[PDB]
Amino acid sequence: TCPFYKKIPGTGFTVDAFQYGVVEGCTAYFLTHFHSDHYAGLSKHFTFPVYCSEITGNLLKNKLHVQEQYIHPLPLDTECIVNGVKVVLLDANHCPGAVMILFYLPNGTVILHTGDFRADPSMERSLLADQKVHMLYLDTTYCSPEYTFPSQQEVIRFAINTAFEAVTLNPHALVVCGTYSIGKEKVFLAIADVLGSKVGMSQEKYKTLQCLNIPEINSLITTDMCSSLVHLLPMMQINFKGLQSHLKKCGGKYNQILAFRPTGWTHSNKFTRIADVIPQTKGNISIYGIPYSEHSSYLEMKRFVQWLKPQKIIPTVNVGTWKSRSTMEKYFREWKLEAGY
Ligand code: NI
């Protein structure tokens, strides 16, 4: 049964609610992004209208085989009427195709559902600037002050400089980057650009990338592993055993691996600066954990919410424990007393 924080009151709508069977009263199912916890339940047998971005609708049709007649892609930054209700899709600064959804209820209430997002000051000049929001359905993944991490730009600078130094010292080093979902494509694309290489990957991953409307993508990726010195592998294989095994397969072209695991936050964030990050090493294999986040830090979250000034907040993440819920409610009240709304 569908939880309350996935239902939009005063409408026939749900958000990211595909694993509950037929939801009673739902006339349109919205999907914020193509991450498995959110699309869980969709398949070629789904027969209700799905509303989403163009990129998400490319992934539904090619990866999950949802039939075309049930996919309703909407342009971003554009007022659209869905089953009698005005909606707008906004870029969420998450993975490719990820959106926030603004719902203009027939009674005058305005609701923002962030989906998963990385808040940014650029959102203060979107179509959100133009009107009041009553209710905020908020991605609270990192809603505690211990969650700090650098900008995406600082993290990519570290990765490019690290990779370029290693391969210029040793032209026979291979770079490997872990993946298990869409998102974080800048990590492997930026490294391959500095090295003058395409990114090599499996046919299944190439297929997924080809759905993403990334400009000039045919110039940047390939399935021919032998022609590439940046390889993508499943995240599970980014360990000493999995990397040793991969280096065997390359036929003595390479004699060293430098590997990257983009994680979210890890507790080594509470002590170490990005500049000071060091790898784990075993013989000719080195593994870097790099804190590349596609969710808001605590400070970015707090800035967005204090700017928006919602009347009510509904968290969508960390809702399963009383301790989490009480922590989050305490910070919401702090923010509201400090800013004065
Ligand atoms: Ni996500």
| 209 vs 309: CA distance, rounded Å | 37
For residue 341, report the distance from its CA to the centre of ligand 1, in Å: 30
For residue 226, report the distance from its CA to the centre of ligand 1, in Å: 32
Token representation of residue 24: 């009673």
For residue 35, report the distance from its CA to the centre of ligand 1, in Å: 5
Contacts 24+ apart (CB under 8 A), 98-105: 98/32, 98/33, 98/53, 98/56, 99/32, 99/33, 99/52, 99/53, 99/56, 100/32, 101/15, 101/30, 101/32, 102/127, 102/128, 102/133, 103/8, 103/11, 103/13, 105/9, 105/10, 105/11
For residue 294, report the distance from its CA to the centre of ligand 1, in Å: 8
Residue that is written with structure tokens 């949802």 in the block: 66
| 331 vs 341: CA distance, rounded Å | 14
Side-by-side strand order, sheet with 99-104: 80-82, 85-91, 99-104, 110-113, 135-138, 312-315
For residue 100, report the distance from its CA to the centre of ligand 1, in Å: 12
Within 10 angstroms of residue 338's Cβ, the number of other Cβ atoms is 10
Token representation of residue 316: 């969508």
Q: Which of 122, 174, 125 is nearest to 151 (CA)?
A: 122
CB 175 within 8 A of CB 229: yes
Q: Which of 198, 273, 188 is nearest to 228 (CA)?
A: 198
Which CATH fold topology does 148-295 show? Answer: Rossmann fold (3.40.50)
For residue 233, report the distance from its CA to the centre of ligand 1, in Å: 20
Token representation of residue 121: 């000051």
List Cβ neighbours of 295 (8 Å cut-off, separation of 6 or more).
Answer: 94, 116, 117, 118, 139, 141, 142, 264
| Angle 182-45-62 from CA coordinates, rounded to 5° | 35
For residue 4, report the distance from its CA to the centre of ligand 1, in Å: 20
Token representation of residue 238: 């980014």
Q: Which of 287, 260, 309, 249 is nearest to 129 (CA)?
A: 309
Q: Does domain 1-147+296-341 have CATH number 3.60.15.10?
A: yes
Residue that is written with structure tokens 């600082």 in the block: 154
- Distances from the Cα of 279 to the Cαs of 162, 239, 260, in angstroms? 11, 12, 9
Q: Please give, one letter per residue, the 3-state secondary structure of the chain.
A: CCCHHHEECCCCEEECCCCCCCCCCCCEEECCCCCHHHHCCCCCCCCCCEEECHHHHHHHHHCCCCCHHHEEECCCCCCEEECCEEEEEEECCCCCCCEEEEEECCCCCEEEECCCCCCCHHHHHCCCCCCCCCEEEECCCCCCCCCCCCCHHHHHHHHHHHHHHHHHHCCCEEEEEEECCCCCHHHHHHHHHHHCCCEECCHHHHHHHHCCCCCCHHHCEECCHHHCCEEEEEHHHCCHHHHHHHHHHCCCCCCEEEEEEECCCCHHHHCCCHHHCCCEEECCEEEEEECCCCCCCHHHHHHHHHHHCCCEEEECCCCCCHHHHHHHHHHHHHHHHHHCC
Q: Residue 118 corresponds to which amino acid?
A: R
Q: Which of 278, 251, 236 is nearest to 174 (CA)?
A: 251
For residue 255, report the distance from its CA to the centre of ligand 1, in Å: 36
In the chain, which segments carry CATH 3.40.50.12650? 148-295
For residue 92, report the distance from its CA to the centre of ligand 1, in Å: 10
Question: Resolution to 1 decimal, in Å?
Answer: 1.5
For residue 50, report the distance from its CA to the centre of ligand 1, in Å: 18
In the chain, which segments carry CATH 3.60.15.10? 1-147+296-341
For residue 334, report the distance from its CA to the centre of ligand 1, in Å: 27
Q: Is the dihedral of CA 2, 5, 6, 12 positive or negative?
A: positive
Side-by-side strand order, sheet with 285-290: 221-222, 199-200, 230-234, 173-179, 256-262, 285-290, 280-282
List Cβ neighbours of 7 (8 Å cut-off, separation of 6 or more).
Answer: 13, 14, 17
For residue 115, report the distance from its CA to the centre of ligand 1, in Å: 8
